[PDB]
Amino acid sequence: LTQQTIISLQREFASAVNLYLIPKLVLPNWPSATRFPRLTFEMEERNDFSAAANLMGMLINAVKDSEDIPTELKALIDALPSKMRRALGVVDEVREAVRQ
Amino acid sequence: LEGASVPVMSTSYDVVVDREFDELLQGKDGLLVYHKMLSDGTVKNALNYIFGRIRSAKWYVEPASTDPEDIAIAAFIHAQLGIDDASVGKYPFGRLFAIYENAYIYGMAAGEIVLTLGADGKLILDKIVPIHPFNIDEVLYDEEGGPKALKLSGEVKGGSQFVSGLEIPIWKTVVFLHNDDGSFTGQSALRAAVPHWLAKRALILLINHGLERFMIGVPTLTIPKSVRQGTKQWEAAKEIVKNFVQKPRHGIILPDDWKFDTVDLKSAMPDAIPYLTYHDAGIARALGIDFNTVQLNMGVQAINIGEFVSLTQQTIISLQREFASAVNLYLIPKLVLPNWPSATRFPRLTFEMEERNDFSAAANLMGMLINAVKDSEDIPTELKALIDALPSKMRRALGVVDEVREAVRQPA
Amino acid sequence: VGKYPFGRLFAIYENAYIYGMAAGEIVLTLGADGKLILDKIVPIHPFNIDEVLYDEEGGPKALKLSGEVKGGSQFVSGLEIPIWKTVVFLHNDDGSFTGQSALRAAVPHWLAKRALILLINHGLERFMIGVPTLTIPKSVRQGTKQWEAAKEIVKNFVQKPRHGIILPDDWKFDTVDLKSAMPDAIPYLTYHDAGIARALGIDFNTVQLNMGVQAINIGEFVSLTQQTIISLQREFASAVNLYLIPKLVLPNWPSATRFPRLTFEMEERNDFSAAANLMGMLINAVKDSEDIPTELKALIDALPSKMRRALGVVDEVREAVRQPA
Amino acid sequence: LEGASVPVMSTSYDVVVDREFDELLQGKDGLLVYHKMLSDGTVKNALNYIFGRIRSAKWYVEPASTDPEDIAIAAFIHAQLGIDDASVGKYPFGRLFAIYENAYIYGMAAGEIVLTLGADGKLILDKIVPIHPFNIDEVLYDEEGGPKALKLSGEVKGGSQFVSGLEIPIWKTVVFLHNDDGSFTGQSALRAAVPHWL
């Protein structure tokens, strides 16, 4: 119940960074830029980790005999309905790009 | 084919004027009461929970149909709001919720919709200018009782100038009403909490006063009839009574015809805490919260707190629908029509229903679906086909298969 | 959520629940497809209904309205609308076409609660502060310095307790002996207060909520309350099915003899774990099918009633709408 | 393509002036009350929990789209902040949270954004200079009630000189407001706790 208060404060903080800071860092380097990256966070409302970890195991088992498990697994996850996708966590394409 | 034969009429009869019978809560004097209630810790605790839960409802855009054009228009709106997993969004998204919060507290609020030319050649949302009910003189109506404009008066932020009877047409605005009864009159959610709030404040004053007389005692000094005011003896009497209260360690030396005592109150102090917390917790009950916000986790209670949080969801889901209705009626058509002048049906802002925790059972079913299509040549396609064929309860438990999100996530 | 007018119908039904009856004017316009479509519902508040007019057989034929146009442009006096231009919501119609407020049976508990809060407020002051008494010699007369001193003592006892009381030896100060502790009226107050919600057919305590020693199974009392709320859902659906849907169908299909019906999913018990498990067993059975959706829908419609209904609605109308042209 | 016809207006009516009715909590005298409340053990216990949970929220950067260019720009920002599993980050990341904490306590705070030339040729974040509400005289507004600058007065740390009415344009700053009602006026989160504290 207390998380509904604290998540509101996280949104207030993110809004200020997204409005005042990020455009000031992007425009100098990309003067034509029309849309901007956004700072955001993972929603923590309830502890569904046991059920979510079990589903993660069932997804891996399904793509196990794949010639490229990472690619097939990421494809299968993005196809899940919203509640099921979000329970596994963030598939961070920006982290992936930085780690190249 | 004929239009309406019945006009919109005021909710007025006898002492009830535009839904209100109590003179102290009529018009802008009413707004000052609701403003003062925001300084109460129990009111603020309730609004923090309610407003937090509303924003967390997993907001998304449903298209008018599965037609590719309806999907395209829905994707434009998705992009305008910055729909995302945390409902952070682009700047104006958050501003709409802040205006709706003023409507919840005061009964009505609004924003001016400002468009600009996008890089694509499309007209896009530039900003929402918030309008506070303190700065609304009145709503103006046509001859059939339909709203046509807002009349505004107030000081420009910074104190450069006063605004005096400025009129803005309704078609340039989004208007949020709380609990509209059909007359286009909003009402503060705090209305039914006023009696409990007044009672709580009066009881805290009474307990504070009682605690001093039972904690310290009321000193009495009985002296001979010969002692008159303005004597050395008289000063000594006043000094004894004063020191009893201020300097208890001092002690009291008396001649044998002077008698000191405290008033016998003839019982223990009454325990008013249960009656105080009845009125205090009653503030949150009046907003439709179905768990005790003052005792919270303390004391002997029901085993299943989760069920009382689920009961509270029926109140908060109603507020989510009220917010969505206003966006769908006032904002989305104003963003679509400039770019698609022939448009006859519109995307709708909506949310995921959160009533019960069925996640363990739903995740287990999700696993059984994946296992069934596992040896498919294209698992995503087959899985989405199988899900849309499920009976309603089973489909909805898995979550939203968001075709608009899918269209946006198309790489160019 | 729906389109704008959907929500407006629920707001009108809410007025019917509170007051006994309410109504809305149905306004149609020409759609892009050439069809007559719903334009809007104009809500009608019972404060603005003079009466229902009846034919010679006691069937309703019109509403007579009086009220002020919103914004105060003019007063409307005895305006008559035929019933066929309206949706009418009655709460608990007994067969006579007379609605009754759901709040009727709560009035006594509401009056008792208000009277008890006044009585407790008054009692709490006399037990918390005390009623001061001052006994003085017969010689002390009104309109004297001594008389003012007496009035100042009793006033200050109430207002300024830290002040203290100095008395000559033939003056006696006391508080009235009430001869017992204050009676605990909280249980009787909460009996009447919680009684307001009992009178509306709610079967859990809405005043104590989660607090105090209780039944283990709160869920069963929420299920009992569903029998009240499902009845209200049927009352709402009946009015839409009778007054609104035929008015949307007949203009476009003048020969129409049968009509679609607004309905809802029955929510009585939480059988979701068992139902989700069965759904998994059905899928596993048709898994090696060349067309799983078709075979699965065939198998589900063949299930016995309890088992079919537990899975939810197989909505053929939703399926038709979701057809891309 | 029409401009706004309605200006931003103050939340003021009768005794309510810019959201506040109690004289003892108006303006900078108000800030002294909220500062004193920080020495209360129950206030500090609550702020420790709230501020800790905010920083622990697994912060990351979402791109404007799945387009490779939008991903590239998002990666630049990710690198500027030093996004990582513990939300430790590079020096300035932590400074933004410290400034937001002042906004929560007092109602508003700010930071000056300073850029420098990076090794790659790009303009990069050099630092955020924190601005405390004790050292803000006022926000300056345009004719439509939009904020344009901050006017500052205070003593330079170390006591070298007093600064008097220094003006910084808003485009050189990040501004944090707590619970902005639409008027660009923040409010202390501690406001509703004052009666219980007394």
Numbering used by the authors:
A (entry chain C): 336 to 435
B (entry chain A): 26 to 437
C (entry chain B): 113 to 437
D (entry chain C): 26 to 223
Please give sentences taken from the publication describing this entry:
A key step in the assembly pathway of double-stranded DNA viruses, including bacteriophage and evolutionarily related herpesviruses, is the packaging of viral genomic DNA into the procapsid.
As the previously determined structure of this portal protein was for a construct lacking 20 N-terminal amino acids, we determined the structure for the portal protein with an intact N terminus. One goal was to test whether this segment adopts an ordered conformation. The portal protein forms a canonical 12-subunit oligomer with an overall shape consistent with those of portal proteins of other viruses. The subunit−subunit interactions of this thermostable protein are enhanced compared with portal proteins of mesophilic bacteriophages SPP1 and T4 (34, 35). There are 39 hydrogen bonds (6.6 per 1,000 Å2) and seven salt bridges, compared with 26 hydrogen bonds (4.2 per 1,000 Å2) and five salt bridges observed in the SPP1 portal protein, and 22 hydrogen bonds (2.9 per 1,000 Å2) and four salt bridges present in the T4 portal protein. To investigate conformational states accessible to the portal protein, we performed normal mode calculations with the crystal structure.
